[PDB]
From a paper:
PNGM-1 is derived from a metagenomic library from deep-sea sediments that predate the antibiotic era. PNGM-1 has both MBL and tRNase Z activities and is considered to be the evolutionary origin of B3 MBLs. The wild-type of PNGM-1 has two MBSs in its substrate-binding pocket, and each is occupied by a zinc ion. The zinc ion in the first MBS (Zn1) is coordinated by the residues His91, His93, His188, and Asp210; the zinc ion in the second MBS (Zn2), by Asp95, His96, His279, and Asp210.
Numbering used by the authors:
A (entry chain E): 8 to 335, 343 to 373
B (entry chain F): 6 to 335, 341 to 373
C (entry chain H): 8 to 335, 345 to 373
D (entry chain G): 8 to 373
């Protein structure tokens, strides 16, 4: 213990802990809202299974900085599930795509996401057009880097389907069911592996599906909205609009509690509120009106270890100065000679360091 | 601090929202200074420019930069004009976050985006933005049901990437000019903002080129890519020696090249960015610049701020809220619902669970 | 609003806001425990009144970094009140003393603190021996800088006194009353000024005095201990020792609620617990069992604005890279030491030329 | 592997890494100035040797938050060496003393420091009067916790002695030599163990002793002052006083260069400056005028691993929300011989809280 490693550490240092064969690790890489802030990236979850499979559920704007702090090689993070096509649920897919490829991902991204009520409201269309949006980046990068990693294979599934299997691979099952939020399309996921069940709610008004299909989850994640008082205080909403937000549009803390009392998970996770010194306590208290079981109030870099005997909540202590960590056909140039003729002579300036570096 | 009860003047840090901008002043905040690889210390390239006439502009809005921009306490409606140097993810990735975020938070005007063409339609900004709006069609259509759709538009102003120091923007005595960069493939540009005797230059991404030294000449603030050392490229990224040497000569502007460029420009103040600014990277990069450039220099990091006045170009750090909220500034019900009855029929009765707080709140 | 200042800002930027003549600002500069943490300095409060007076109540180990982030000239913070002589309540007095002096505090520090049951248990004895403890620092610094600011004038008051005035100047009154904690000496304070009453509880097991003398405070601060469950989980304590800690030694969250139910303050402040993602919630719940009124769960750099109409909680956003801000004898060397100098003219010659021109 | 630990990590996670039997780890738990700042605690160094020994060299105001972030049990950090009796070099000794003792530390603290030109300018007096300063804390704590860990045993050494052994145990040698700062007493240390030599400069204007006794250290830590231009911009100082600060009083970046040129250490560490985005660069340029060897510009939580083949600089990434971590410890009972420090006058004031605490109290006993 003098020279040796401190065991069972009270914080999670990403890349410092072996994952056991009968264990799951879940890390919140975004817990926040459609509005950006350094304290909270938009919705993103990393799941690491003891079998060695790793999934991303949601990759909202700003979450890539949290994901990259985990010291996980890009080739282990190629399978992404989207609950919804909000920018705060998949905005950083383009950063995973582009950054991973420049940083040695060799395999394409695999993306599972819902359909909508028509083609242009679904995940296939969305990813297809994101790729065209970044055509300049794709074509220029593809000149100097083999484009195989630049492909995104989309597995779109019917948003309407009630607890149907959307993924079955290597003893891992993902089921989806609908959400009620903004318009048709958003879903929740249940990940089933090795007698474990992890539920990723996504975004919804309270629904009849989640309480049924999430039942007995080892870890149950659901949206848990800021209070009507907080909507008045913070967003300057009139009393009636603030009231409606927690009845019509979203799952209230009180509703979240009803739902988790119905679900009886080993551990419930509230997320998708601004987790501030002046907001969290009314939200936690709303939940405890109706649910008394183990509860985590999520913020960025919270981590859950799921074992047979426990679901433990810790905070990740991860590097702000993050770096990519290493894992184990002719194309047309996109330059004209008009541009390449612009090169400045810098032979003189670079001479000293160049002679020293080659020696 | 002249009084116990009163405001400390000329504060050594910049608190966003706490300072009046003078009529002959420019404020520039680095909202991202980093790389195509994400990290909490450094968002990807983003700049906020505030002029004394009340005009504000974003130059680049790379992945991760929106949290920094939101920490500035500037109403969404004042940040509608966005200039892109390149169509890399790490230069316009967070354009979508600004578009959706500000629209939810009460922006009332459409976004306005100036970006370069490419060699053909599908390599320029008009095509890029059109397809980004299609990519987020679900979010657009669902949000347009409950929020007026007008601020969900993006007006694109595409300009010729080939043009040598020509105007791309002219409004209210503010000029932006572009000239080309040499980077990845045709399209990327540098910008010069001219207003009220001032010239601010946003370099973007380039191998050393003949245009910047001429067109950036005498800028109040000159920003230019300044790459990590070949030795770092080896130490960090385990690059095989020759690759590491070619990166700092052919692909990017080395610190030494940046020095030559800024010695030619003779700016009032020069800014190196686009490297990982760490306790074991920054010093050799600095030394590299000083080989050739002796003038005023900032080694940019996130939330660094420059005040440009007639007498000085000041560098300070911004001290800004991590727990940021949108700040308020000064609905077409003839839209088809994007719900079907099938999904609406799924609602859980939660009347009991919510009655307690619901009674109380209606007092 | 484009060119202009953002009004009524949602965070407090220290040095950015004028205090009105009927306003109080209280900043928690330390909310923690006798064990150190970058997240929570030990007990320290800065109070700013609209009449321009400023006070420090407690200055525990680690709090000086928070106090220095406030951009307050050292000469404005010369008056310090100590609730108790725990290192986690006055450990940073020496940092304020030495730091302020080198940074151009011109006036001596003034310290109000309790006596104990005998001379060697009181503030007078403590500060006299603190200055001897740092006599090398004192003597060497005094050679180069005038020693007036290096004086500490101690105002020891009787710990036993029941709600008596220990300070009265410029319309500001502090009263003390005793606490029940560790041993005889610890006290709570009440600052009264311009119809406002701010209570600094210090450290206590629940006592009959605080509920009486704190009644109707604008801001009531009281110890609010971590739970007997948190005591076993975090300190591997035996169940019965973990039970006693929250009944005999300290104020339980539940006791805190009872006390604040009795006090009926405009705003209650719970502090002196580790404010963590897995501790804070049970502490809040315990309080809410008995207290329903406005409550803050304190952490470092929380700030309250006390006005006629409101008591507001905000977080302060302050510089980590802090600098002192300007407000408006025989050598201790022997020749044997001054002889050891290394010549460095050559090495320093280049810059010495540039600088002088 | 997807399942395994990432090896040779680019940041140090305190408590995550086994220390090699022929390895030294040095952590800057404080690198700053007489004035306080969240970014930089005052001068403090933690040194872990492969043999299991650990030492603290300096424990300035603010450093204890950093030291506690290391997940080291209190019982392993009972040996402290002071280079000077400045508040910003030993201010947090008291925090260590009180906090460890409450945390469950069972060994007294052991303090090594310099004498001065007379009794009341040396460490023995300083620590004696520090214990008297905290007499209320001592006597109240000694009622409920065993008093033996509350002792501080002082080993005062002669400040004038040129490179003499002030500590010698378990194959570890500490030597001291003088410095030229503020007045007589402040020293530098050299820690020698298993063919390694680590030097803690302390504070000094440039001296003849450092370059001689520091020669060929694996890690050489020396004061390296902010620039005279920086003294003018920051502290509004006049030109001549600004100039004098870097010549008369402190080691300029340029002098630091000369000294490390002369010492030729494996790795040089510059510290004791405010490490800001607008100060660090000129200070680095200053050192490079005369020193070309491996250099760290120190800031808080910077860590050096010293091995036969390399000296590696990493940043430690450590918990802000720190907790004491348990290690080996005695279950020493409180001394019932000790008088209570309560009088019946104070005890008579207890409020009845039976009711408010009965709900959670019952449930807790179930
Ligand atoms: Zn959402
Ligand atoms: Zn770039
Ligand atoms: Zn206390
Ligand atoms: Zn010092």
């Amino acid at each position: 213990s003098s020279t040796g490693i401190a065991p069972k550490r009270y914080v999670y240092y990403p890349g410092s802990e072996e994952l056991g064969p009968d264990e799951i690790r879940v890390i919140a890489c975004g817990t926040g809202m459609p509005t950006a802030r350094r304290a909270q990236a938009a919705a993103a979850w990393v799941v690491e299974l003891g079998n060695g499979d790793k999934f991303i559920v949601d990759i909202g704007s700003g979450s890539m900085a949290n994901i990259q702090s985990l010291m996980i090689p890009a080739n282990y993070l190629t399978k992404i599930f989207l609950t919804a096509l909000h920018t705060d649920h998949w905005g950083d897919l383009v950063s995973m795509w582009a950054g991973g490829w420049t940083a040695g991902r060799t395999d394409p991204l695999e993306v599972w996401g819902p359909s909508g009520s028509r083609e242009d409201m679904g995940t296939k269309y969305a990813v297809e057009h994101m790729l065209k949006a970044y055509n300049w980046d794709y074509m220029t990068r593809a000149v100097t880097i083999n484009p195989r990693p630049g492909d995104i294979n989309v597995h779109e599934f019917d948003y309407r389907a009630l607890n149907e299997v959307v993924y079955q691979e290597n003893g891992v099952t993902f089921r989806s069911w609908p959400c009620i939020h903004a318009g048709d399309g958003p879903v929740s996921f249940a990940l089933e592996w090795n007698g474990y069940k992890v539920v990723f709610g996504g975004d919804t008004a309270p629904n009849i599906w989640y309480p049924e299909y999430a039942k007995g989850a080892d870890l149950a994640i659901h949206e848990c909205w800021m209070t009507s008082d907080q909507m008045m205080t913070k967003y300057n909403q009139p009393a009636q609009l603030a009231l409606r937000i927690n009845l019509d549009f979203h799952t209230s803390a009180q509703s979240f509690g009803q739902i988790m009392n119905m679900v009886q998970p080993r551990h419930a996770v509230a997320y998708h509120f601004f987790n501030d010194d002046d907001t969290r306590y009314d939200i936690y208290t709303g939940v405890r009106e109706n649910y008394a079981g183990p509860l985590s109030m999520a913020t960025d870099m919270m981590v859950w270890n799921i074992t047979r005997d426990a679901v433990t909540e810790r905070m990740a202590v991860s590097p702000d100065h993050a770096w990519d960590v290493a894992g184990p056909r002719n194309r047309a140039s996109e330059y004209t000679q008009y541009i390449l003729d612009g090169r400045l002579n810098v032979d003189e300036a670079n001479a000293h360091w160049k002679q020293e570096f080659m020696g």
